Amino acid sequence: FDRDRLFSVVSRGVPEELTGLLEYLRWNSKYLTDSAYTEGSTGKTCLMKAVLNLQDGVNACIMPLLQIDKDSGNPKPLVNAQCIDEFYQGHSALHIAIEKRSLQCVKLLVENGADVHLRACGRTCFYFGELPLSLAACTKQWDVVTYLLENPHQPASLEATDSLGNTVLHALVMIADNSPENSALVIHMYDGLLQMGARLCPTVQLEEISNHQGLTPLKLAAKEGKIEIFRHILQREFSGPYQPLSRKFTEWCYGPVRVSLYDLSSVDSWEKNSVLEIIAFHCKSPNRHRMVVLEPLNKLLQEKWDRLVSRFFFNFACYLVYMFIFTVVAYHQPSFGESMLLLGHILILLGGIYLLLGQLWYFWRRRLFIWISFMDSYFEILFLLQALLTVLSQVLRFMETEWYLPLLVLSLVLGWLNLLYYTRGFQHTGIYSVMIQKVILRDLLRFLLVYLVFLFGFAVALVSLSAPYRSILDASLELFKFTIGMGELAFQEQLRFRGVVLLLLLAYVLLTYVLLLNMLIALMSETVNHVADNSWSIWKLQKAISVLEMENGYWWCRRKKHREGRLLKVGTRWCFRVEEVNWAAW
Numbered sequence: 001f002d003r004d005r006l007f008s009v010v011s012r013g014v015p016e017e018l019t020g021l022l023e024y025l026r027w028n029s030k031y032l033t034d035s036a037y038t039e040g041s042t043g044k045t046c047l048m049k050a051v052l053n054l055q056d057g058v059n060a061c062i063m064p065l066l067q068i069d070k071d072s073g074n075p076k077p078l079v080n081a082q083c084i085d086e087f088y089q090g091h092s093a094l095h096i097a098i099e100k101r102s103l104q105c106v107k108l109l110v111e112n113g114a115d116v117h118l119r120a121c122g123r124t125c126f127y128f129g130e131l132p133l134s135l136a137a138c139t140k141q142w143d144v145v146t147y148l149l150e151n152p153h154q155p156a157s158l159e160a161t162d163s164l165g166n167t168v169l170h171a172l173v174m175i176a177d178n179s180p181e182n183s184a185l186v187i188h189m190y191d192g193l194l195q196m197g198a199r200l201c202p203t204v205q206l207e208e209i210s211n212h213q214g215l216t217p218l219k220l221a222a223k224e225g226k227i228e229i230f231r232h233i234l235q236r237e238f239s240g241p242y243q244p245l246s247r248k249f250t251e252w253c254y255g256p257v258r259v260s261l262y263d264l265s266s267v268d269s270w271e272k273n274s275v276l277e278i279i280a281f282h283c284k285s286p287n288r289h290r291m292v293v294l295e296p297l298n299k300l301l302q303e304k305w306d307r308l309v310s311r312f313f314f315n316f317a318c319y320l321v322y323m324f325i326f327t328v329v330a331y332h333q334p335s336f337g338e339s340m341l342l343l344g345h346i347l348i349l350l351g352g353i354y355l356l357l358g359q360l361w362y363f364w365r366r367r368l369f370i371w372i373s374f375m376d377s378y379f380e381i382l383f384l385l386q387a388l389l390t391v392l393s394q395v396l397r398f399m400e401t402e403w404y405l406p407l408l409v410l411s412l413v414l415g416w417l418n419l420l421y422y423t424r425g426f427q428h429t430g431i432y433s434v435m436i437q438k439v440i441l442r443d444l445l446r447f448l449l450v451y452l453v454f455l456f457g458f459a460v461a462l463v464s465l466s467a468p469y470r471s472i473l474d475a476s477l478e479l480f481k482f483t484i485g486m487g488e489l490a491f492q493e494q495l496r497f498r499g500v501v502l503l504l505l506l507a508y509v510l511l512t513y514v515l516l517l518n519m520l521i522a523l524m525s526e527t528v529n530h531v532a533d534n535s536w537s538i539w540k541l542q543k544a545i546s547v548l549e550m551e552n553g554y555w556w557c558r559r560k561k562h563r564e565g566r567l568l569k570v571g572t573r574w575c576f577r578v579e580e581v582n583w584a585a586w
Helices: 004-013 046-051 056-060 062-066 093-099 104-111 132-138 142-149 168-174 180-200 217-223 228-234 275-280 295-305 310-331 341-365 378-399 404-422 430-434 447-465 474-484 500-528 538-551
Strands: 248-250 260-263 575-578
Touching: 004 046, 046 062, 046 093, 056 062, 056 104, 062 104, 093 104, 093 132, 104 142, 132 142, 132 168, 132 180, 142 180, 168 180, 168 217, 180 228, 217 228, 217 275, 228 295, 275 538, 295 538, 295 575, 310 341, 310 404, 310 538, 341 378, 378 404, 430 538, 447 474, 447 500, 474 500
Parallel strands: none
Antiparallel strands: 248 260, 260 575
């Protein structure tokens, strides 16, 4: 019956759940819908309440409850109580039992048949993998995970997918955290499951299954910013009977030298969407600059940066030549002839078209998505802006318009200003790389706005109080001179008797001094801290971005990527020789 009194008596009212009658005879009419109205309140079942019991004795009484009923006129939905609430959909009692640390309960539940490949969702606030095996692995239940996949007549596939395409290995990475108490658990369970996978089915590699978006556990650990598990996977050296299928093995260890062969699944060539692109481009975590100082990556980055450093300075020289030519042509503007002005105009127009096409191609390829909108792309917008201004100014010359000269001059100024993009070559300007964006953002576009607001509020008052012809030009020009140190104050004539005019300037100078004093302290506050490290890593990230961008080639296709490694012997595999030299001194 649906009466709550009977269920309360059976479950909690009295441990004597063996009433005898129950639904043993004449109750076999229930064959279509044995849930909701007849079982549970709205989305639960009697099995869920039975498995919620704490004492082992009453837990052992579950088997008599489902005895005979498991093979009675009751239909197939015996244990798989798929909730239709759309909120806890498919949250059968098996997941609850696995959540409980008891082993005999889950053993009894699985021995009665049931199913282990049922999802926990149909698409809360706790993502574990939406699978029984995934939940058991994430809950660190060694006995449950050991028993689920081998012992029963119906096993659980180790490479079973998920709603999003994940597997247990992906799930162990998604739930990972930088906290050591969770990092140790994740690493230990990942290693144990990887080792057991070899025993179960060694004919399939578990770290090659991709998500619906094409990511593997190594790449999934890099996109999401998880550093500890990523570091462990990069430097995995587990050996013994399962020494093969690893990542870092030493070749010889003569003295302090420990030359080793790091495996490479993070090579740009012959592999699209590698780990380096994900770290550099497709990442938004605060740790993205900390994942590039790792040992197997620094050597690969330097061996490409040194090999491709001539082109950086070649482009630098070619840009300096273009800027010198632009300045020379601009300076000799009449307002020799027909021999240098025409050639300079043609060269400037061609140079502008070149930089316009290059920046358009760069934006089309890379930034089809959001560029974090706040970092690492300012110099890629300033180049486009300068090229567009130069092209427009050079076009407007043929129209005999008066706006050609201001646009040309502004383009020249912006082109000279953009030369700071190359300060990251041999020049170790990492000191300015720290306080070059954290001092302009939120500090020059936030406090300067208030200063402009005060200036424009005082200029109009000065004009309206008193011959000033323009409200926002005549008074503003003299009001701005207080900041630079050229403001002039006087008692003036006696047409308005003045007085308040002096008071307004006295207020203005005090306000524009206290604002500067506060602005200085605001930027100083971020100097006492962020000193220990917090540098030399973002510089390496910028160098990595530059190296990755260069290898794609120029606007045309006069560049093709080349191989990085070689078919080194597996041992029973493209590898990179890292000649570690560390004085452990033991």
